[PDB]
Design a protein around this ligand. Sequence first.
Ligand code: YGQ
Length: 822
Amino acid sequence: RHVQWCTISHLEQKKCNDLVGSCNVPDITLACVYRSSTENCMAAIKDGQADAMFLDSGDVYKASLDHYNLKPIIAEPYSLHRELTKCLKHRQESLGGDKMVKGRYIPQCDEKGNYHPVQCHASTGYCWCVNANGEKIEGTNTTPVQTPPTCPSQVLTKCLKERQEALGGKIAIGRYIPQCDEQGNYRPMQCHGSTGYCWCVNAIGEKIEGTNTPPGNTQPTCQSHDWDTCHYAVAVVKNSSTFQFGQLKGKRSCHSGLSKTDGWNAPVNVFVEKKLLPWDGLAKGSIERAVSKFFSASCIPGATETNLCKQCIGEEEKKCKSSHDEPYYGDHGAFRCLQEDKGDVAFLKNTALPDEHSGVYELLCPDNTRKPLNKYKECNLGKVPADAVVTRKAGDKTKDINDFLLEAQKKKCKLFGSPHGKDLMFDDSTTHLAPLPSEIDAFFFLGVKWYNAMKALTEDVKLPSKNKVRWCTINKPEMMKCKDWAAVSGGAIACTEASCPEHCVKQILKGEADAVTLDVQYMYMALMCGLLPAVEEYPNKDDFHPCQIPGSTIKDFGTKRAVALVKKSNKDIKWNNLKGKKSCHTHVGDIPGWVIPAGLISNQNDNIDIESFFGESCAPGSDTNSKLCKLCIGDPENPSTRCSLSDKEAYYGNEGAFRCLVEKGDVAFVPHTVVFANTDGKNPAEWAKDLKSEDFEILCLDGSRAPVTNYRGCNLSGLPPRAIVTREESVSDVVRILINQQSLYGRNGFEKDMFQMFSSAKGQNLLFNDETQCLIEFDRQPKDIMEDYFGVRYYTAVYSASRSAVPSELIPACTFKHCSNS
Ligand SMILES: NC(=O)OC[C@@H]1N=C(N)N2C[C@@H](OS(=O)(=O)O)C(O)(O)[C@@]23NC(N)=N[C@@H]13
């Protein structure tokens, strides 16, 4: 296996070549491929000439576009603010669950708020081992009859671990040994035990620039509890000059480079906001030209304007290249340009500032003051996104790149410094590189605010009208019905196309669409990504009053209620003893007949297979050999149609599960409507025949029973309605436009002869479900949106009332946190 790294300079190629020799990762060989600039490397990776390079966030954005089609895959983790530990969050979530779901696992946290390595489930007496994230180590469960397992100790904190490594297992004399606090985080002030120097670090141990102090001098105050580890764009100046930020016009400037976010996007955004630059849209020429009029002479590697390359010092064709062969390229090159007095101000980020407190440099704040180097958090041009290793979108080398860097970091190879110079291959300030979420792209990595801000400098971005709802459609018939809606809507409705509901959620997140109707099984993912219900489908045929007068009180929303249905004859069966019994399920994947029962059973029995929990059962979709297909009859006109997802199975579906109950089962998992639909001689067939409703009851979660009529107070869970989701800031617009459309084209629409929202000749259930009575505004309560939309019962039964389930690999990408401003 091979990884070919693209380098942009002779200096970087030298360092990459040293790593080929010095860094021995078994099974993966590194090789180095030289190109003369950042853009030529981007093209080499797109073309397969190389596999990976490290890019500034501004180039991550440029590389994501169709010319190159690259994506970020590895980056340094960062933190925005201190958070609850994972164990304490899990305890709070599970204590907030539905108390009628009895016997749930509540985690056990220790005096630092971490998981005890041994976790136990009170109601079942089972114990198991966990990792630092509280996830079960599979195959360590022990039953109550045995003593609790022996579980390895928890991994030490960053500080205690680096203290252990520094000590090397026998004092490390003459070397820095980190000093940790009681919680095992880094003390704010650190001192070198041999040189006498002291400096400040944040809570995860990163040095604060501008704080390094030789012995005998006064130390700057170190801030405690600093968990803001985003990097900051800053403007650095010498204390021998005296201009302020608003007098930059006509000065000389050094920039890390034309495409870098700290050397271009951040300062330029501020120039534009302050109107120091006469420029707003692409009608006034390019940004680069306007900047060319502002400064008298600059070094901005990668620029074309002549005065913006005037102060660079690269020899011959190397001059002004996005490459270390231009000595003023990058953060440290821009600082060198100030230091050598080719510029009056350098634009870079806090991680390239001097570590020493004392000296001739300080920061130029945009509020027209100057502040010391260590005050960049209050004197800056914005937080900037993380930088990242990128590769082709297809990801054919992602695993090899990840494996190599994880192994090289484990072995402590010299990835992050070099004799040959600074910031070669990676930023010298980097300490660890970790894999990003597998579905991350530039949009989710940079975040919507920085992504749009960098788009804004390249094109005028016409913002879509808040008076138009772009509806996302998932198949061609839906598209065609939405084109008919658009034609009658007077421009209120437009249409977009995607292949599946998850891709619609992506389009709405990225501003390509505005709304989509989602089944229940997608709402957890939509709500985690930050969309909100705007309106919901009301399905109750018996009461039209909430549809007639909007806003009025809904007596019964009318969704299905999952129940456990048993015969009045069998009077021993209660909820708490279904184990081993024979059960009938509509089919695997059905929410009321499977997801809700499987959910409650795993919550109360340590995630035991619902296949193993019951005795013999019928649940179409299971494997024909398993005990879940034994009751499954098949087709009476024998063909093999057994345990199949069709009507060719006698026991399939809502009626079929009810069949299996009366014929040969103790319990059936079904919506509450099925019993009334097949009793009181409502079904003609011979098995139904008579079968009085009062011959059955439903099981309550508290061990009691009730007649099949009290499903509102004695069910497993009610389902929430389907919802129309949108972005939070668009909810009020979408509600207004849809309610208006509904007064025209709903079931009592004033213009319902011109168009019907809730039916179509083109297909069934297009855009909305065909039995929808109307759409009702979602009344947002002051509570967690999970609990608000699902209801506490469903949230607990299906998701353990947790925000940590991952039913879709999009969730880790769309919840990735960003380094944005306000
Ligand atoms: N009447 C009725 O059912 O309205 C449904 C409507 N939409 C939902 N998805 N919900 C879930 C229900 O949760 S539940 O536990 O009460 O079922 C709810 O009623 O709270 C509700 N939450 C809010 N804010 N409005 C409600």
